[PDB]
Amino acid sequence: RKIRNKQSAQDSRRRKKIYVDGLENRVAACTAQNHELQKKVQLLQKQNMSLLEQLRKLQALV
Amino acid sequence: RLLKKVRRKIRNKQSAQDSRRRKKIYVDGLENRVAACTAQNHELQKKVQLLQKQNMSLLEQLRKLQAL
Protein backbone atom coordinates (compact mmCIF):
# COMPACT_ATOMS: atom_id res chain seq x y z
CA ARG A 1 0.00 0.00 0.00
CA LYS A 2 1.08 3.66 -0.58
CA ILE A 3 1.07 4.26 3.27
CA ARG A 4 3.24 1.04 3.83
CA ASN A 5 6.04 2.55 1.70
CA LYS A 6 5.80 6.09 3.19
CA GLN A 7 6.76 4.93 6.72
CA SER A 8 9.28 2.52 5.09
CA ALA A 9 10.77 5.50 3.23
CA GLN A 10 10.86 7.60 6.50
CA ASP A 11 13.02 4.91 8.12
CA SER A 12 15.38 4.53 5.17
CA ARG A 13 16.12 8.31 5.45
CA ARG A 14 16.21 8.39 9.35
CA ARG A 15 18.69 5.43 9.00
CA LYS A 16 20.76 6.86 6.14
CA LYS A 17 21.60 9.78 8.43
CA ILE A 18 23.02 7.27 10.86
CA TYR A 19 25.10 5.57 8.15
CA VAL A 20 26.48 8.84 6.79
CA ASP A 21 27.32 9.87 10.38
CA GLY A 22 28.97 6.52 10.57
CA LEU A 23 31.28 7.06 7.60
CA GLU A 24 31.90 10.66 8.86
CA ASN A 25 33.19 9.14 12.07
CA ARG A 26 35.25 6.35 10.47
CA VAL A 27 36.74 8.83 7.93
CA ALA A 28 37.27 10.98 11.10
CA ALA A 29 39.28 8.74 13.28
CA CYS A 30 40.80 6.38 10.68
CA THR A 31 42.32 9.69 9.44
CA ALA A 32 43.35 11.07 12.87
CA GLN A 33 44.77 7.56 13.62
CA ASN A 34 46.59 7.33 10.23
CA HIS A 35 48.19 10.63 11.25
CA GLU A 36 49.51 9.51 14.68
CA LEU A 37 50.56 6.24 12.96
CA GLN A 38 52.82 8.34 10.68
CA LYS A 39 54.21 10.28 13.78
CA LYS A 40 55.11 6.77 15.10
CA VAL A 41 57.10 5.98 11.92
CA GLN A 42 58.76 9.44 12.26
CA LEU A 43 59.86 9.14 15.89
CA LEU A 44 61.02 5.57 14.88
CA GLN A 45 63.06 6.76 11.85
CA LYS A 46 64.78 9.36 14.18
CA GLN A 47 65.43 6.63 16.85
CA ASN A 48 67.07 4.38 14.17
CA MET A 49 69.39 7.26 13.09
CA SER A 50 70.57 8.05 16.72
CA LEU A 51 70.81 4.29 17.46
CA LEU A 52 73.04 3.37 14.48
CA GLU A 53 75.21 6.46 15.20
CA GLN A 54 75.66 5.23 18.87
CA LEU A 55 76.47 1.75 17.48
CA ARG A 56 79.01 2.51 14.68
CA LYS A 57 80.52 5.06 17.19
CA LEU A 58 81.73 2.15 19.33
CA GLN A 59 81.22 -0.41 16.47
CA ALA A 60 83.97 0.68 13.89
CA LEU A 61 85.69 2.73 16.73
CA VAL A 62 88.52 0.04 16.87
CA ARG B 1 1.46 36.16 -5.88
CA LEU B 2 -0.59 34.23 -8.40
CA LEU B 3 2.41 32.47 -9.83
CA LYS B 4 4.66 33.44 -6.98
CA LYS B 5 3.52 30.20 -5.39
CA VAL B 6 3.72 28.28 -8.66
CA ARG B 7 7.29 29.38 -9.14
CA ARG B 8 8.53 29.65 -5.56
CA LYS B 9 7.36 26.05 -5.20
CA ILE B 10 8.99 24.62 -8.43
CA ARG B 11 12.30 26.55 -7.74
CA ASN B 12 12.39 24.68 -4.39
CA LYS B 13 11.75 21.19 -5.82
CA GLN B 14 14.63 20.84 -8.25
CA SER B 15 16.83 22.67 -5.62
CA ALA B 16 15.93 19.71 -3.48
CA GLN B 17 16.67 17.27 -6.39
CA ASP B 18 20.22 18.66 -6.60
CA SER B 19 20.86 18.49 -2.85
CA ARG B 20 20.08 14.74 -2.96
CA ARG B 21 21.91 14.03 -6.38
CA ARG B 22 24.88 15.83 -4.69
CA LYS B 23 24.85 14.02 -1.37
CA LYS B 24 25.14 10.77 -3.37
CA ILE B 25 28.46 12.17 -4.55
CA TYR B 26 29.51 13.14 -0.97
CA VAL B 27 28.67 9.75 0.43
CA ASP B 28 30.61 8.09 -2.37
CA GLY B 29 33.32 10.52 -1.33
CA LEU B 30 33.47 9.32 2.27
CA GLU B 31 33.21 5.70 0.99
CA ASN B 32 36.41 6.37 -0.99
CA ARG B 33 38.30 8.17 1.82
CA VAL B 34 37.28 5.47 4.32
CA ALA B 35 38.49 3.10 1.51
CA ALA B 36 42.03 4.24 1.01
CA CYS B 37 42.66 5.94 4.38
CA THR B 38 42.07 2.41 5.69
CA ALA B 39 44.11 0.44 3.10
CA GLN B 40 46.91 3.10 3.59
CA ASN B 41 46.70 2.99 7.42
CA HIS B 42 47.76 -0.66 7.46
CA GLU B 43 50.56 -0.42 4.89
CA LEU B 44 51.61 2.42 7.25
CA GLN B 45 51.43 -0.08 10.14
CA LYS B 46 53.60 -2.60 8.16
CA LYS B 47 56.20 0.19 7.95
CA VAL B 48 56.17 0.69 11.72
CA GLN B 49 56.38 -3.16 12.02
CA LEU B 50 59.56 -3.60 9.90
CA LEU B 51 60.97 -0.45 11.66
CA GLN B 52 60.33 -1.80 15.22
CA LYS B 53 62.51 -4.99 14.59
CA GLN B 54 65.17 -2.83 12.83
CA ASN B 55 65.35 -1.02 16.23
CA MET B 56 65.33 -4.40 18.13
CA SER B 57 68.35 -5.82 16.13
CA LEU B 58 70.46 -2.62 16.48
CA LEU B 59 69.79 -1.89 20.21
CA GLU B 60 70.80 -5.55 20.91
CA GLN B 61 73.98 -4.88 18.73
CA LEU B 62 74.65 -1.91 21.08
CA ARG B 63 73.80 -3.27 24.60
CA LYS B 64 75.76 -6.40 23.30
CA LEU B 65 78.83 -4.13 23.69
CA GLN B 66 78.71 -3.61 27.44
CA ALA B 67 81.56 -5.20 29.67
CA LEU B 68 83.22 -5.51 26.16
Numbering used by the authors:
A (entry chain B): 217 to 278
B (entry chain A): 210 to 277
Sentences from the paper on this structure:
cAMP response element binding Protein 3 (CREB3) is an endoplasmic reticulum (ER) membrane‐bound transcription factor, which belongs to the basic leucine zipper (bZIP) superfamily of eukaryotic transcription factors. CREB3 plays a role in the ER‐stress induced unfolded protein response (UPR) and is a multifunctional cellular factor implicated in a number of biological processes including cell proliferation and migration, tumor suppression, and immune‐related gene expression.
To gain structural insights into the transcription factor, we determined the crystal structure of the conserved bZIP domain of chicken CREB3 (chCREB3) to a resolution of 3.95 Å. The X‐ray structure provides evidence that chCREB3 can form a stable homodimer. The chCREB3 bZIP has a structured, pre‐formed DNA binding region, even in the absence of DNA, a feature that could potentially enhance both the DNA binding specificity and affinity of chCREB3. Significantly, the homodimeric bZIP possesses an intermolecular disulfide bond that connects equivalent cysteine residues of the parallel helices in the leucine zipper region. This disulfide bond in the hydrophobic core of the bZIP may increase the stability of the homodimer under oxidizing conditions. Moreover, sequence alignment of bZIP sequences from chicken, human, and mouse reveals that only members of the CREB3 subfamily contain this cysteine residue, indicating that it could act as a redox‐sensor. Taken together, these results suggest that the activity of these transcription factors may be redox‐regulated and they may be activated in response to oxidative stress.
